[PDB]
Amino acid sequence: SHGQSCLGCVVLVSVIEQLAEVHNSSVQVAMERLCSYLPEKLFLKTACYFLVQTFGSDIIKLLDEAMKADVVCYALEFCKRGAVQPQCHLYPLPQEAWESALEKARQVLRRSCSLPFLTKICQKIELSIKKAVPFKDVDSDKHSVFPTLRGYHWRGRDCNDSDKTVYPGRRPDNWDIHQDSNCNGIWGIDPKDGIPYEKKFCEGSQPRGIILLGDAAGAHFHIPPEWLTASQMSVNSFLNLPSALTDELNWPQLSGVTGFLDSTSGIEEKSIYHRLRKRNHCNHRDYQSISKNGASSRNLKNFIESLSRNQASDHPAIVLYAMIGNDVCNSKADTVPEMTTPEQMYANVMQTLTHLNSHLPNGSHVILYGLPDGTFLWDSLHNRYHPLGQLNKDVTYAQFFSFLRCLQLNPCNGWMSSNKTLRTLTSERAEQLSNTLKKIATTETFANFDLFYVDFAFHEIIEDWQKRGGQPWQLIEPVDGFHPNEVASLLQANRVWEKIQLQWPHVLGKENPFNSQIEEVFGDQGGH
Ligand SMILES: CCCCCCCCCCCCCCCCCC(=O)OC[C@H](COP(=O)([O-])O)OC(=O)CCCCCCCCCCCCCCCCC
Ligand SMILES: *[C@@H]1O[C@H](CO)[C@@H](O[C@@H]2O[C@H](CO)[C@@H](O)[C@H](O)[C@H]2NC(C)=O)[C@H](O)[C@H]1NC(C)=O
Ligand SMILES: *[C@@H]1O[C@H](CO)[C@@H](O[C@@H]2O[C@H](CO)[C@@H](O)[C@H](O)[C@H]2NC(C)=O)[C@H](O)[C@H]1NC(C)=O
Ligand SMILES: CCCCCCCCCCCCCC(=O)O
Ligand SMILES: *[C@@H]1O[C@H](CO)[C@@H](O)[C@H](O)[C@H]1NC(C)=O
Ligand SMILES: [Ca+2]
Ligand SMILES: [Ca+2]
Ligand SMILES: [Ca+2]
């Protein structure tokens, strides 16, 4: 909270200063320009102009004294030193020079979420974090007709939000003669022979859904670098800001597992959902991302009940257990003691699997993902420039991670660290947890699903990518410097798909021979 207010101030002031540089304008003009770019939705533009009204004169005075954003934000008291909270420097400065600058700033100012609108934004964000089910959902079946706030970006769109027995993944109601009860777009009678289309096209095709149990990576956490790069900034940079905020800065609709939109990169690789739908068009809309920022084996229990699958009335599902780093990645200064132990991981996963067995239809399939070896994050990025540092070449990822660490906001103290010993210990723990998951999958059995393990194998992805001409830093989210980006997520989903195809082809089911007839009769099946 102190960390978040400090970091927010430093980012905003940095963008203001860089916009003044890019346009060769005054700071007043740069601040007007920033606010002018923002959407009116969610009070974003209005909040910006209120901030400029409240703090703008002081920002002008301190940038006029050549203070950088970190000094400005301490002078303005958005950043504060405490007994167990040192002052955090984003830019390298001798201590004397930092203290002189901060004292000058404080002198300049002496000469002469409670805020309106921002409070509204803060409340809506908190509510989005707290809730794992859609806000708009008249019939309470957890599927929505709206995209964000845990709506159809996260799970198949509800084709009838006035009927809690109509939703994606349901076994059809007497072959869907009069209503498309399972939202796959297939319904009605073939006039040639009187046979219900859902019966002739889907009977015996063994439909199944895809369910992700995921973290921020799984939900495709992504802050557009366009929001922080003054050199290319305009109105069009922020058009996606309202939707991204109401999706908790996640983009599940573009994720490697549950993505259903056309990919940004346009690469061949498609999401697991897209491949399952392609294999059997009866599976149209049967995706769910049961994923939350910060999820780990320890706290998945706090939102897994948001999963929607009726054991008696729904088709089976492929369930991917993808707690792929927060059991080792944390923000505690003494970070190793905070990491999950193999014994804790065993207990936590067994509790999840026992819960799943009583909440999945029989015939389901559960795949446990191993944890990545994140040592290539530091290796790939530490000398490159962060988006906020690209204009003036003055913030490397090493400097960015050090700043976050000081603020207790670094998302992975163990891997995003200049300390090689610590990075090695973190990878060792991740491999021990992966071994625990592999032991569970090859030993424990459950009545309603079979159980499997797949390794994460980031090295396979980096090799695929380097073979195509790419570099490893291009696989990482530029703003957070931590999460796999959209490309990386899709490449990893491709590896997983192909492993399942070779190792356990029954998990994917058969290719439906009526796919082409489904498209001829129903087209896009109602879209997404
Ligand atoms: C004087 C006015 C002051 C107020 C002005 C407001 C300006 C913007 C406020 C910034 C608020 C800072 C929020 C940081 C927290 C976001 C990340 C988060 O909470 O989600 C969890 C995520 C990953 O979770 P996991 O991987 O641990 O599972 O955790 C992470 O991935 C950590 C992310 C850390 C990197 C963030 C770098 C930059 C912040 C992004 C700001 C977004 C820009 C918004 C518009 C900008 C207008 C210029
Ligand atoms: C969505 O579900 C609602 C509720 O089941 C449907 O409305 C019903 O329509 C039938 C049609 O025969 C009526 O007999 C019921 O009285 C209606 N129920 C209510 C509560 O109004 C609606 O038709 C469904 N939409 C589609 C496209 O099938
Ligand atoms: C780099 O990290 C390593 C591992 O976390 C630190 O090594 C530990 O240091 C403490 C004392 O500071 C010892 O009690 C531990 O036994 C050490 N553990 C290991 C595995 O060596 C090391 O101090 C860190 N180095 C720097 C420069 O911060
Ligand atoms: C410049 C004025 C507008 C400021 C908008 C603040 C946007 C940052 C909010 C951070 C959202 C975090 C969402 C989440 O990860 O749960
Ligand atoms: C559940 O499905 C599995 C796999 O198809 C099958 O072997 C088993 O007999 C089923 N269990 C029941 C109780 O029908
Ligand atoms: Ca609904
Ligand atoms: Ca419904
Ligand atoms: Ca149907």
From Swiss-Prot:
Question: Where does the source fall among the domains of life?
Answer: Eukaryota
For binding Ca(2+) 1, which residues are annotated in this chain's numbering? Answer: D137, D139, D141, H143, D158, D161
CDD domains attached to this UniProt entry: acyloxyacyl_hydrolase_like (cd01826)
In chain numbering, the residues marked as site (Interacts with lipopolysaccharide) are R298
SUPFAM superfamilies to which the protein is assigned, alphabetical: Saposin, SGNH hydrolase
> Which keywords does the record carry?
Calcium, Cytoplasmic vesicle, Disulfide bond, Glycoprotein, Hydrolase, Lipid metabolism, Metal-binding, Secreted, Signal, Zymogen
InterPro entries in the cross-refs:
AOAH (IPR039676), AOAH_Saposin_N (IPR048593), GDSL (IPR001087), Saposin-like (IPR011001), SaposinB_dom (IPR008139), SGNH_hydro_sf (IPR036514)
- Report, as the record phrases it, the tissue specificity of this protein: Detected in peritoneal macrophages (at protein level). Strongly expressed in kidney cortex, where it may be produced by proximal tubule cells. In liver, expressed at high levels in Kupffer cells. Expressed by dendritic cells. Detected at low levels in alveolar macrophages.
Assign the protein's first listed, main location to one coarse class: secreted
Q: What is this protein called?
A: Acyloxyacyl hydrolase
Gene that produces this protein: Aoah
